[PDB]
């Protein structure tokens, strides 16, 4: 796979080539792949190769990455969340 606007990657803290899970609200499908960078500002979310069987243009999806750390560090961990409006325009998150 999935190519993602590099701005979006940065906002969610996801790295190029990092494993990602994708959960499709439109069709229910859930799959795992890795992140490819698309051009900053392109607002692209492109499913490539076999992943094209799991989403179509227009589908609404959640894209997540997961990390590991010790128990103690996990108790104050804060995930990055990026929110969107209209045509993949990033909006500010609340508390």
């Amino acid at each position: 796979x999935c190519a993602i606007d590099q701005d979006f990657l940065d906002a969610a803290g996801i790295l190029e080539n990092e494993a990602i899970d994708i959960w499709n609200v439109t069709n229910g499908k859930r799959f795992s792949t890795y992140a490819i960078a698309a051009e900053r500002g392109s607002r692209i979310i492109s499913v490539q190769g076999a992943a094209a069987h799991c989403a179509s243009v227009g589908d609404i999806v959640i894209i997540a990455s997961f990390v590991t750390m010790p128990d103690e560090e996990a108790r104050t961990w804060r995930p990055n969340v990026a929110y969107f409006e209209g045509d993949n325009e990033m909006k500010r998150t609340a508390k």
Partner: peptide
């Protein structure tokens, strides 16, 4: 409270919430 342990947790690092797919490309 959850007691402290020595184990490694898998935690949500971050997510894109309700982003919309723009392209689907089976062959590339």
């Amino acid at each position: 409270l959850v007691p402290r342990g020595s184990m490694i947790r898998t935690m949500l690092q971050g997510k894109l919430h309700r982003v919309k797919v723009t392209h689907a490309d089976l062959h590339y």
